[PDB]
Amino acid sequence: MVKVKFKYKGEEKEVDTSKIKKVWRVGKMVSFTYDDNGKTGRGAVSEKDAPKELLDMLARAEREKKGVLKKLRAVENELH
Amino acid sequence: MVKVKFKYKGEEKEVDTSKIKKVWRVGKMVSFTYDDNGKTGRGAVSEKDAPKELLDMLARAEREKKGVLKKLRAVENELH
Amino acid sequence: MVKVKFKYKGEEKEVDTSKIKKVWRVGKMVSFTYDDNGKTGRGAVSEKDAPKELLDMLARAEREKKGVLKKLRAVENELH
Amino acid sequence: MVKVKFKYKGEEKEVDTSKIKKVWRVGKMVSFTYDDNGKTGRGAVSEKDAPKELLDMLARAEREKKGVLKKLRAVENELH
DNA sequence: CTATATAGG
DNA sequence: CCTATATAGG
DNA sequence: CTATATAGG
DNA sequence: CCTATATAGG
């Protein structure tokens, strides 16, 4: 039962890592989005203050991305 | 923190979903590679036994692969 | 030295099949574009009144397209 | 109407560019398949001897493959 | 000698 | 996979 | 038995 | 290409 503690517009917030819809890195930052009851809830926390399960999500996200990319890059070279 | 239990090569294995590096769907089967303490490990359970957590990871990978698929399905119909 | 005789906005026009930049079919029609000295020159002539070299261009165009498509379609199914 | 002259399997061939079904570039080589009277024929000349007409066909195929490549190169950088 | 891009085999 | 083509690379 | 999606071999 | 997994298909 891990929760990512972050701030959004200065206010403290706590999302349930399992309610997080997607993750990605922007430098040192680990941004993400959650389902805050119907709408898109944004948030980002610096890597060093991020729960491990959030980093795992980010990791799998970057891996999932690289793959799609390596696959996209492929179709491009087939067009020279 | 959920230990998904499976049987690989006759060995009743059990890996914490946190170690999961990648999850993908093959029919009604959910396969995944995990961090087998340094090296890449593998395992598969039937969707039926997949803990909701693992299925969420899978749903995140898919949610993304479906967005790019949208753009491709785009640039596609934009035939001529 | 083939020229496609077509009408554009009621006016007669004659483009040099080799000055045609690209072709594609829209039903019975064979549309295309030419380099009318710097800018994009449009035109379309029904298939039955189209020079053979224009049909060959259309043919290769549809073949070139199908290929790119068959290649695009591929990358999509790799994302299920 | 230009007869591109080439040597295939020791046979000094010569096909009217009108019969060309597809042209593509392989290094400084221009390959192409033509309509060998019903069946698909093949041939290749060095860009150097390619009549401007054939090279135009090639330029049309490429012009298009470069547009799709643009959209893919698009949906690509649009990482996250 | 294989690589390169391709279609038919 | 192989072919057949022009040229490159080492 | 292969197909299916995949990563490491 | 092979493996190893759940299930499908015939």
Side-chain angles (χ1 to χ4, degrees), chain C residues 1-2 17-23 53 56-57 59-60 63-64 68 72, chain D residues 1 17-23 53 56-57 60-61 63-65 68 72:
Chain C
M1 226 279 203
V2 194
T17 72
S18 51
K19 194 171 62 200
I20 294 300
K21 280 167 64 73
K22 68 186 305 311
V23 194
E53 183 43 47
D56 297 333
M57 288 186 51
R60 293 191 287 280
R63 189 186 307 282
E64 211 55 272
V68 183
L72 221 36
Chain D
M1 200 322 124
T17 53
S18 70
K19 307 214 174 308
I20 299 299
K21 301 184 64 179
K22 182 195 192 60
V23 189
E53 211 193 323
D56 285 335
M57 293 180 203
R60 276 183 273 270
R63 199 174 292 265
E64 218 63 1
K65 290 182 182 181
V68 38
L72 298 187

Side-chain angles (χ1 to χ4, degrees), chain B residues 64 68 71-72 74-75 78-80, chain D residues 64 68 71-72 74-75 78-80:
Chain B
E64 218 63 1
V68 38
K71 291 167 160 294
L72 298 187
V75 331
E78 317 176 321
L79 307 173
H80 214 189
Chain D
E64 218 63 1
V68 38
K71 291 167 160 294
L72 298 187
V75 331
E78 317 176 321
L79 307 173
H80 214 189

